[PDB]
């Protein structure tokens, strides 16, 4: 079995000197990746060391009290692990690691990575857009069904469409509102709204469709993912040009028995069709084609099974351990 | 002489359909770099075609292509010698007519889409973006004619000035901490898009900071000119861009300096390279000893000193000319990174 350090993106609760946790109390895509990843890792019986997230006891899991990047680099210089798995985007790197420690990253950004050697990408669209070479492995966002509402949880479906993410132009909140209005359905707008003008223009334009609820967390987040009719993942090629790297909410919605309407943006082209349908860019959604797009979305059972088949936390973590071992074997790229 | 197509970063005005101009109506430093460069280029006798900024004040030609598709269609048919990208690779070399040269100014913390024919505003940026030793470094240009002069005789005021996004990596908090140490006021000019951080500042340093929100036009210019110093306190903090923050070119420094205002900054990325020309580099974080920051503040150079400094190092003409040099190199068949 491996000892594997998971370097989470080091990040402070806004306003606080407290840390954002893995998993996160609210908004936080990468911290969710690490959490369904570490769960998988541990189920495979690997030893996990959680860094950049000083956070929640389970066997095999060590939460290192290191969050400051220099606290991490220091801890990592003397750490007795086999695999440094960076999820932070290069807050730390390969140099200064003890000899025979393998370096690996999962790339979660639209920009080219600090550390392209031993880098992995959420999608082929991402790899391409970041300049990743052909032998660079593409490994999707993983999802632990245990973190999310199951069929056994008995959460009933309701009428609304759901947006969960930052209320920002590249996330397509306005386009979500335009789709939901085209279907004659409410959009619950769950997410941090930090850009006032764009928020106000959403409500000015689709005020009667959208219900803004702010950033959400814990039980509410899971109940919302579980109950929504569809989750809207409508990222837009705006200024990068925005290419969605891995689209965290697509595995969450699907694993919560919720199908997805998204765009073909970056990674959405590759994953959305497995659990829903891809629509075009913009806000010009003809109503009946839209309601028609809604009514050919799979059922809770089929998306919940596609999620696990394709992105299951154990399956995906096994795809990573095979890389860790290529690395430790003397394998490299790119 | 040359016709240079200059690609601004195409961005809509928030909540509107209209475009952010060059120079920008408010906040935006790529849009100023471009404005300041265009000035230089226009002065040196070249023809400029401004893309990525339809609707801007119009030998300049402002092209009505703002959308990247709109821009790249125009580029595919234009008769220009040089395409100069400032957008971070919203467009690229492929599909330009044969013998059009490609060059970018890299304005970002992250590695560029178009590493070939890329230039960086600072050596920290180039190092940090993985740019080769052959990739020109050419800092932010400043056109003095865009700012207050000595002749303008703007009366200096007591206050310290922050001018940027009130975000953590820009160190608004730390600037408030530095102003409080000096016993001065911090005029906090800029977009506060992040409530809790901004609430964090006002909580710790409420009698120190005067938040005014975003500014432009004549208020902006006067503020740059009347401030006792400008605060450029970027922090080596982790971010949404991914990685540690590393200030690539720090446009506000050149602005301050050419306005007769000295700068107190950190050593973050480019700052280390430009701030000691026009003021003092200080430590990261909020722990400033009063008397020592007070020292730092009274030891800063005078208006005349920094203005001579800005022009000398970052003069729009002198900086546009180092670009042209790079344009001709490319058209002559040179390459790099
Ligand atoms: O109010 C919210 C909005 C979003 N999220 C979470 O934030 C992540 C969104 O990350 P994603 O990669 O989909 O969007 P991005 O982080 O790229 O903007 C997902 O885990 C969401 O469940 C949340 O917890 N509360
Ligand atoms: O209220 C404001 C705040 C900032 N700025 C301008 O915003 C740009 C800040 O760019 P800088 O490179 O210093 O910081 P960054 O672009 O990385 O946020 C500069 O031109 C400032 O003069 C402005 O015009 N009004």
What can you tell me about this protein's structure?
Chain B: This is Putative glycosyltransferase. Chain B: Pfam families: Glycos_transf_1 (PF00534). Chain B: InterPro entries: Glyco_trans_1. Chain B: It comes from Streptomyces viridochromogenes Tue57. Chain A is an alpha/beta fold and 334 residues long. Chain A folds into two domains: 1-140 and 313-329, Rossmann fold; 141-312, Glycogen Phosphorylase B (Rossmann fold, 3-Layer(aba) Sandwich), CATH 3.40.50.2000. Chain A is 34% helix and 15% strand. Chain A has helices spanning 29-43, 69-78, 124-130, 173-182, 196-206, 218-227, 248-255, 268-271, 287-295, 300-311, 313-328; strands at residues 3-7, 47-51, 61-63, 83-86, 102-107, 119-121, 161-164, 187-190, 210-214, 230-233, 260-262, 276-278. A six-stranded parallel sheet of chain A has the order 3-2-1-4-5-6. In chain A, β1, α1 and β2 (47-51) form a beta-alpha-beta unit. Chain A is globular. In chain A, 53% of the residues are buried. Chains A and B meet through α5 of A and α5 of B. One uridine-5'-diphosphate binds next to α1 and α7 of chain A.
Topology:
2 copies of one chain form a homodimer.
Chain A: E1 3-7, H1 29-43, E2 47-51, E3 61-63, H2 69-78, E4 83-86, E5 102-107, E6 119-121, H3 124-130, E7 161-164, H4 173-182, E8 187-190, H5 196-206, E9 210-214, H6 218-227, E10 230-233, H7 248-255, E11 260-262, H8 268-271, E12 276-278, H9 287-295, H10 300-311, H11 313-328
Parallel strand pairs in A: 1-2, 1-4, 2-3, 4-5, 5-6, 7-8, 7-10, 8-9, 10-11, 11-12
The complex binds uridine-5'-diphosphate (2 copies).
